[PDB]
Symmetry: D2
Subunit: 116 residues, 4 copies
Amino acid sequence: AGITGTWYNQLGSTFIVTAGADGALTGTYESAVGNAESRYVLTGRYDSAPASGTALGWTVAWKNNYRNAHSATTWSGQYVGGAEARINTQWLLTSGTTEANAWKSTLVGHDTFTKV
Amino acid sequence: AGITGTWYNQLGSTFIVTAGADGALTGTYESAVGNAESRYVLTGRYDSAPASGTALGWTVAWKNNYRNAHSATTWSGQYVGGAEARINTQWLLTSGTTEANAWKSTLVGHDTFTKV
Amino acid sequence: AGITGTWYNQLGSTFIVTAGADGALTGTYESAVGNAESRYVLTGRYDSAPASGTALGWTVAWKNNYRNAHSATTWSGQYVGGAEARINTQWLLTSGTTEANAWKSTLVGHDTFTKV
Amino acid sequence: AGITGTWYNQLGSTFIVTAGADGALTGTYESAVGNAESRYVLTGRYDSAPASGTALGWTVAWKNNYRNAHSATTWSGQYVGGAEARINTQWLLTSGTTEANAWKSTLVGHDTFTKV
Ligand SMILES: Cc1cc(/N=N/c2ccccc2C(=O)O)ccc1O
Ligand SMILES: Cc1cc(/N=N/c2ccccc2C(=O)O)ccc1O
Ligand SMILES: Cc1cc(/N=N/c2ccccc2C(=O)O)ccc1O
Ligand SMILES: Cc1cc(/N=N/c2ccccc2C(=O)O)ccc1O
């Protein structure tokens, strides 16, 4: 119940997710930034029997029927319930590159999601 | 085909994956470290229409029928095919923590997977 | 002028720094968290001819005359001037470990400093 | 003695360092990549009274008499002595950016330094 719903980050992106009783996360991501357009499929996992926040993570490959950025982001973080539910994360964005450029293929950042 | 198979990291963990035509990664991860015991389920996404490496990412929540570490790792990287295929990644491992310990909830590292 | 001064982060730590005309950063760090006590020496570098924010970085090894945590943190970020001067960073904290534990030796986080 | 010397990473960059008795690292870094040309100054800190590896870290701002990339890298890691000594690190490279691009200002990677 907690995790399932609609969430937004500080860039204005939208994450719609359903938490399955088996630990699965499925939904769609709508990005406000990058070489973006329309929604993208996401998939992840979460601790379905937490103790503390609830550990979780998900991935988006930035390819849909309309655009392909040849890149993927993974967000790793924890869900914190309360009056104000939040998902605090750190993320890694890797771009497909040639061997010579691989050393500079990965960005790191942090995003905070607020539930709506 | 390329990504689909059994891979091993430097620690000796085993990543069994199936890459779907549509961009899904599904499979099992058997760890050689941490508060482990048995296999865990993973899910991810990948660029199913690459341009040089193939961007991808996946998540494992460290909970199975035997134990629960109340944490999850996300791996973000690229698959590089050829005679000696490899998946080069960076990872983030987040633990569920109290708010007071949240500043130190996330470890970062790098893993190289090969078929040997 | 800009960077030189006293700054605090969201954990309540204090950073006192002087920016030299040659790109050097020198000062002391006073930590609110960890296996801490008293102040620690810092040293870093910054872009002394920026374009955009000003790139910079610094290190603290958590050893003084009173305690030794056998660890060091590096903060990498940029200084942004204005009414409200800020230093936005991401950091890595590495602990000295045995070979068997090296894979889990490094934490990653983010800190925002406000000038006083 | 141990840390003091000339080291090389996987890219072929050269790190010339002097470790002070008190915990200071000082030296020069000559890059084999990026918007480079010549040597750059570095400064860092290290644990001068280790317990297994020796925690350390350093910064380079990418500005010299010839060019300025308006960025800086920080390396955080540990020195492991012996017959075949190594410095294993993770790094963060931050570029000075406008606020609109700040979300993607930081690259993350890993470097291994050896004496060969
Ligand atoms: C659409 C698109 C988005 C993109 N990075 N997105 C993100 C990355 C990290 C954190 C948040 C976002 C975010 O969108 O909220 C990169 C290429 C691209 O084509
Ligand atoms: C079994 C178990 C494993 C664990 N970290 N593993 C990893 C973390 C990062 C990269 C690789 C692994 C790897 O296993 O290959 C953390 C909790 C836990 O219960
Ligand atoms: C005193 C002490 C501090 C410590 N982490 N500090 C930090 C690490 C990352 C970001 C901010 C801090 C901060 O202090 O603002 C780790 C061991 C230790 O003995
Ligand atoms: C000369 C130059 C280099 C640069 N990144 N270098 C690096 C970054 C991370 C790790 C190693 C290096 C390395 O050189 O070993 C970025 C701007 C620039 O002008």
